[PDB]
Amino acid sequence: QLLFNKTKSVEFTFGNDTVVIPCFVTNMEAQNTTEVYVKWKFKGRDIYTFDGALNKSTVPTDFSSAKIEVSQLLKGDASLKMDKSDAVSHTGNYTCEVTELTREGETIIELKYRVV
Amino acid sequence: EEELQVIQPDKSVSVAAGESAILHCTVTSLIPVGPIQWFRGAGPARELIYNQKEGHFPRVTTVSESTKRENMDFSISISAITPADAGTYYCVKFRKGSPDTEFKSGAGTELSVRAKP
Ligand SMILES: *[C@@H]1O[C@H](CO)[C@@H](O)[C@H](O)[C@H]1NC(C)=O
Ligand SMILES: *[C@@H]1O[C@H](CO)[C@@H](O)[C@H](O)[C@H]1NC(C)=O
């Protein structure tokens, strides 16, 4: 499998303009982004996907601000960023699933809102 | 670039109840991008037995050193076998998508369970 540097949960307040949910594969050996496929899941739904082969990103309308930095993929960073407006509406357990050729893995991070 | 083969070398495996069953599978290519999963039987109501996702299958363990990019062995070991584990097991390649789609399957391995060694 692909192995992850795991995080139980991440907190955000209104200080956070953009929200970042971390996802770090510890054993990426990818030559190219065309070998890699990312899926971010929330409440059973694919709310972000990146197809390296096609070099295309796909979001549902209620996660329109959701994205990853494709520049950082080869380093093993698949962290999801969305506008705080989207984040407050969608708190809970997020699945980050990475594929590299045939190797496959996932990890879960709870996005928590803290009141200040 | 040879059109992918998914090869289960054993057509059948025989094991005593309580022993472990090594179900063998190897691939000739690692493309297209997408994972290997083990099912028991084929068809719509087929049962998922193993994939590489951590802690989802406590009975099944990777026989291969499958954490390496170079790995093309997807053989698995099913511990504490009982007659309820009997059936045909299939090694199936998938293409990535929403959702993932079956690309290629092996010919299958048929596990049978003796009462005594
Ligand atoms: C919110 O911002 C703080 C810095 O003020 C940062 O440490 C924290 O990780 C951010 N949270 C998220 C979920 O982005
Ligand atoms: C997220 O998952 C953890 C561990 O399974 C669970 O304790 C928690 O209740 C879940 N959170 C939500 C918001 O469902």
Residue numbers in the entry:
A (entry chain C): 1 to 116
B (entry chain A): 1 to 117
From the primary publication:
Using a recombinant technology, we were able to make a special recombinant SIRPα-Fc fusion protein named IMM01 with a special SIRPα-Fc structure, which has SIRPα (V2) extracellular segment domain 1 and human IgG1 Fc, with the N-glycosylation modification site of N80A mutation in the D1 region. After Papain digestion, the number of amino acids in the IMM01-Fab is 142 with a molecular weight of 15,241.15, theoretical pI of 7.15 and extinction coefficient of 0.662. The 2.76 Å data were used for the analysis of structure determination. The interface area between chain A (IMM01) and chain C (CD47) is 973.5Å2, which is composed of 29 residues from IMM01 and 27 residues from CD47, including 14 hydrogen bonds and 11 salt bridges. In the structure of human CD47 in complex with human SIRPα, except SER66, the amino acids that form hydrogen bonds are all conserved. At this site between chain A and chain C, there are a salt bridge bond between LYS53 (A) and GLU104 (C) and a salt bridge bond between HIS56 (A) and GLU106 (C) instead. Our data demonstrated the crystal structures of the complex of IMM01 and CD47 on the common hydrogen bonds, the salt bridge interaction and the water-mediated hydrogen bonds.
The cluster of differentiation 47 (CD47) protein, expressed on both healthy and cancer cells, plays a pivotal role in this balance by delivering a “do not eat me signal” upon binding to the signal-regulatory protein alpha (SIRPα) receptor on myeloid cells. As a cell surface glycoprotein molecule, CD47 belongs to the immunoglobulin superfamily and binds to various proteins, including integrin, thrombospondin-1 and SIRPα. SIRPα (also known as PTPNS1, SHPS1, CD172A and P84), which can bind to CD47, contains an extracellular region with three immunoglobulin superfamily (IgSF) domains, including an NH2-terminal ligand-binding V-domain. Blockade of the CD47/SIRPα interaction can inhibit tumor growth by inhibiting the suppressive effects of SIRPα and promoting macrophage activity.
